[PDB]
Each structure stands twice: as C-alpha cells, then as structure tokens.
Design a protein around this ligand. Structure first.
Ligand SMILES: Nc1ccn([C@@H]2O[C@H](COP(=O)(O)OP(=O)(O)O)[C@@H](O)[C@H]2O)c(=O)n1
Ligand SMILES: Nc1ccn([C@@H]2O[C@H](COP(=O)(O)OP(=O)(O)O)[C@@H](O)[C@H]2O)c(=O)n1
Ligand SMILES: [Ca+2]
Ligand SMILES: [Ca+2]
Ligand SMILES: [Ca+2]
Ligand SMILES: [Ca+2]
Lengths: 198, 199
C-alpha cells in the first residue's frame, strides 16, 4: 500500500527528463491561485535519489507551491528505473483529454448555480480570470444548434466567439451555413459580420 | 496518513458532478493501452458514499481499467463536502497545461533514441498510434523558426504538416507570413501549396 508523503520543497530536484520546455508565467499564476484556494489536489510523483527527490510528475505544482508560500508538497515516492522515469514523464501529460470549451462553459454555469456565486466569485475560487469565465459563459447564449455544431467540431470555438459579435441575428443561421459550406476561417467571418452589422 | 488503496471496480460509482459529456472511444482505447503497459500511474480521487465510492476524479481511468480487464484501481479516499466535490470535478481537469506539439515531438524523438525503439515499438509502449508518433516527428524537419511558431501556437500542427508538402522551400517564409497575416486555415494553405507546386 502506497502513501502520500509531504515532501519539503527544499528536498525536491528538477525532473531530469522534463518534456516541458516553456513555463508560462500566467498559467503558473493560475495554478498558484488554485493552490491557495484548494491546496495541491493531486500528489506529485517523485523518485528518491542520493541528493533528494527527483520530480517525475509535478514541476508546475512545485513552482506553484513555492509561489503560494508552501513549504511542502504531497507526493507519492516510487522506485523507478531511468526508462520508466523517461516514459512516465511524458505519459502523465500525454495520456489525458482536456474538456472542450463547451464542457468548461457548462461547468462554470453549473457551479454558478449550485455554489450560489457571482462570476467574480467563481473566478477567484477557480483561479481563472474573470474574462476567461465570462467569455466561456457567453458561448451558452448562442443558439442550441450552433452549440451542437461547435461540440461536434463542425465549427471552431473561435467561430463561436466571433458569431457573438453579430448585431442582426436574422443573418446568424445563414452565416453559419456559409461558414461551413465554404470552410471560411475566423478572419473571413469577422469581416462578413462587420459589414452585416453595418 | 493519506494512503492509496486498491478499490474494486464493482464498488465505484460514477462522478455525480461529471463535467465530461463526451467519452471518445478512440481516446479510451489509447488510455486502455497505456494502462496495460504501465498500470494506472495516477491514483483516482474518490469519496465514500453510503455504499461504495463516488469518483471525484478518474472516470476515464475507470472505464479504461474495465476495458483492460482490471479488478481494482488505485484510489485516494477523501472526505469532501458537496461543494468541494463539484469544484474538484472541474479543477482537476481545468488547472493543467497540455504539452505543445513540438514538446510532444521532441519527447518522442528523445524516447526513440534513449529507449532504442522504432516508431511502432514506441507507439505500442505509449498507447498511441504509429502515425501519431511519425507525424509529430515530421515537425522536427521544419526550420527552427517555424517550429517555434508551432511551439507558441501561432501555427497549428496541421499547418506544420501541410507546409511539408511545399516543393520549393524558397517560398516557405513568404507563405508563412501570408498564413499568419490572413489567419488562413489548413485547407486554404493546402490550396495555396497546390498552386505553388504546379510551377
Ligand atoms: N497508464 C496511465 C496513463 C495516464 N494516467 C493518468 O490518467 C489521467 C487521465 O486524465 P483524464 O482527465 O483524461 O481522465 P480521468 O481519468 O481523470 O477521467 C491523467 O491524470 C493521466 O496522468 C494514468 O493514471 N495511467
Ligand atoms: N489546486 C490544484 C489545481 C490543479 N492540480 C493538478 O495540478 C496538475 C497540473 O498538471 P500540469 O501537467 O499542468 O503540471 P505539472 O504540475 O504536472 O507539472 C494537474 O494534475 C492538476 O489536477 C492540483 O494538484 N491542485
Ligand atoms: Ca514534471
Ligand atoms: Ca504534468
Ligand atoms: Ca472524473
Ligand atoms: Ca480528469
């Protein structure tokens, strides 16, 4: 039976097989904020070495914990060959599916209702910006069929966002059919919507 | 003392606050294949119900474990309020960053060399298709400045693939400048390359 250990930040060493080459400061601030709200929800995977503990999965969490003022992170300590460490460094990130834009928006909407929160309060609680939450919730004001098209992938989310800018909704559904039939890009749609609006 | 328990598949209940509405069969097969190679690497998070356990994070792992024929999954049992369960069901998915196409491609290249595997063998080891691996490795044949655009997300991986189809490499930089300024999609880039390749 494995345990989750609290490992001191001073004892942690970089992932020797780190596949991430860029650490976005904005995204780390989001993770920091979430850690301040909920703590680290997911234990790191680490491997005990002579000098300390090498991270196998969790470098962002580690950086977020430091930003948040924590002195330890939760971790599962495993004995692993170099080959397993190389594989798992990738697989922990590779073998997962993110939520779609619409699944995210529906989640925000469900939390607003069941947690009884404003969008500002939800952004704080989730560690996301207020514009990020508002832009996703706006997708839920599009016609049902267009939401379906976006989910099915027949329309991009970028098209969805651009469609919100249309003044006269009488042209909305013909505009979507044109986008699809002509495989228009988002910039072409922006330009059509500007004229229609004017 | 938080522990990882092996919990019987039969005792697990679906996530009451599941944000995922689409469970792609192809992606579940990939996860199943990875579970067969490595086991479940990340414990599920669950909460005790009146009987059994509700999944708080891990429904895809749960379904892949059924497809792989497992009897139990590793799980951390936590006491959580309803509010926390609703929050964590989203957050465990929301607060994470994917790898860029180039980071994925570089990782494959590294693993091929250091594990001394062919593309096919690596594909089996990782639970991905052989073309998925091969097609990401092709990105590494692009000029570094275009690789960077793909790394940053200014160009999509599909743009990258399509640009490989260009015969005259002297037209690459002007073509990319056009793609970016005019925000062209993959199909429109295909057509421009179609024309450039016909002399
Ligand atoms: N052999 C593997 C491959 C991936 N994983 C992890 O499975 C999780 C899949 O994430 P997900 O959001 O797509 O699906 P859920 O299982 O959380 O519903 C990730 O946290 C992977 O790191 C694992 O535990 N074992
Ligand atoms: N408050 C939070 C928010 C996210 N997380 C998890 O932090 C992990 C971040 O994944 P990542 O691949 O972006 O970064 P790493 O920390 O694995 O380097 C994810 O598994 C989130 O579920 C957490 O442990 N605590
Ligand atoms: Ca890591
Ligand atoms: Ca990770
Ligand atoms: Ca889940
Ligand atoms: Ca998940």
């Amino acid at each position: 039976m494995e345990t989750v250990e609290e490992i001191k930040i001073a004892d942690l060493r970089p992932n020797p097989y780190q596949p991430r080459k860029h650490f976005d400061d904005e995204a780390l601030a989001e993770l920091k904020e979430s850690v301040l709200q909920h703590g680290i929800l997911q234990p790191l995977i680490v491997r005990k070495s002579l000098k300390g503990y090498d991270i196998v999965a969790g470098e962002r969490r580690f950086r977020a914990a430091k930003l948040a003022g924590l002195d330890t992170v939760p971790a599962i300590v495993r004995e692993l060959s170099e080959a397993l460490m190389r594989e798992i460094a990738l697989l922990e990130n590779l073998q997962r599916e993110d939520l779609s834009p619409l699944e995210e928006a529906q989640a925000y909407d469900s939390l607003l209702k069941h947690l009884d929160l404003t969008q500002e309060q939800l952004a704080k609680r989730l560690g996301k910006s207020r514009p990020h939450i508002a832009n996703h919730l706006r997708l839920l004001t599009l016609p049902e069929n267009i939401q379906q098209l976006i989910a099915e992938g027949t329309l991009s989310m970028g098209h969805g966002r651009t469609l919100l800018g249309l003044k006269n909704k009488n042209k909305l559904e013909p505009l979507v059919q044109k986008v699809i039939a002509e495989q228009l890009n988002v910039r072409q749609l922006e330009q059509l919507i500007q004229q229609l609006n004017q």
